[PDB]
Amino acid sequence: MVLSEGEWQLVLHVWAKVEADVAGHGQDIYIRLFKSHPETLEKFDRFKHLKTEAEMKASEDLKKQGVRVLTALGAILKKKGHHEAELKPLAQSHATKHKIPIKYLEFISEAIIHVLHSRHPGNFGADAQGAMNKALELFRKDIAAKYKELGYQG
Ligand code: HEM
Numbered sequence: 001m002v003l004s005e006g007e008w009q010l011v012l013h014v015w016a017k018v019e020a021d022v023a024g025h026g027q028d029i030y031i032r033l034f035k036s037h038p039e040t041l042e043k044f045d046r047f048k049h050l051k052t053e054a055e056m057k058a059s060e061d062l063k064k065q066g067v068r069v070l071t072a073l074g075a076i077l078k079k080k081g082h083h084e085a086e087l088k089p090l091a092q093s094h095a096t097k098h099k100i101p102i103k104y105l106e107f108i109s110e111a112i113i114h115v116l117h118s119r120h121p122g123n124f125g126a127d128a129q130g131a132m133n134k135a136l137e138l139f140r141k142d143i144a145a146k147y148k149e150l151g152y153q154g
Contacts, residue, residue, distance in 0.1 A: 001138055007131035008080045014116055014123040014132065015074055022074075025115060026066015031056050033111040040104050073112075077135055083142070091146035101154040102144050109136040 003011075018025045031053050034041045042048050047065075050056050072090065076083045094100040113132060116124045124132070147154055 001141060003081060003131065003134050003138065005080075007134055008077075010123075010128040010131035011077055011135045014120050014128055015077055017120050017123055018070065018116070019074070022070050023063050023067050025119070026070045027057060027063055028115045028119070029070070029108070029111045030062060030066050032114055033108050036111065037104070037107045040107055043098060043100060043104070073139075076139060081138060083139075087139075087142055087146055091143050092150060094143070095147045095150045095152035095154060099152075099154065102140060102147070105140050105143060109133075109140065112136065 034050075034056065035053065041050070044065075047056075047059065047062055050059060050062070056062055072086070076086045079086060094105075113129060113136075116132065117129060
């Protein structure tokens with residue numbers, strides 16, 4: 001499954017705007033994920049007690065987590081599909097330490113697309129959203145193959 005260089009440029013041009021303030025984008029993506037699919041918050045032992053969007057917004061630890069997640073995903077997207085080294089540690093921790101099913105990776109993908117669609121209409125028109133969806137589908141397909149190698153059905 002393979003993206004064209006033009007699709008990768010549409011992915012990297014919206015990611016450049018995310019990088020103006022990766023912490024703010026991470027907060028919005030995690031609030032969207034937890035609001036839309038509340039069951040995903042139960043996987044975070046440090047954050048599952050948060051009850052409202054205001055508590056989520058005020059959590060310094062959740063802000064730091066959002067920066068970690070988006071910076072790891074950004075490094076994966078900048079490899080333009082050559083991300084085997086980056087996916088190894090991530091697949092292992094998400095399969096075995098955190099136990100994150102592929103369905104929850106689909107939910108965070110949905111949250112990312114929703115937040116980029118809302119914040120970045122200048123760089124997230126239909127063709128760019130289609131390229132980001134392809135990049136995230138590639139990421140989830142390769143993560144799912146690694147999960148199977150690691151012994152996790154998820
Ligand atoms: C775009 C997909 C994702 C990326 C790039 C990502 C990235 C990361 C990174 C870099 C870390 C820190 C190091 C590690 O333990 O691997 C992390 C931790 C974690 N991830 Fe993810 N993650 C993703 C999706 C998810 C989803 C969807 C969930 C749950 C629904 C999840 C649950 C967790 C948890 C529970 C931790 C430990 C958090 C803590 O220390 O409090 N991840 N993730």
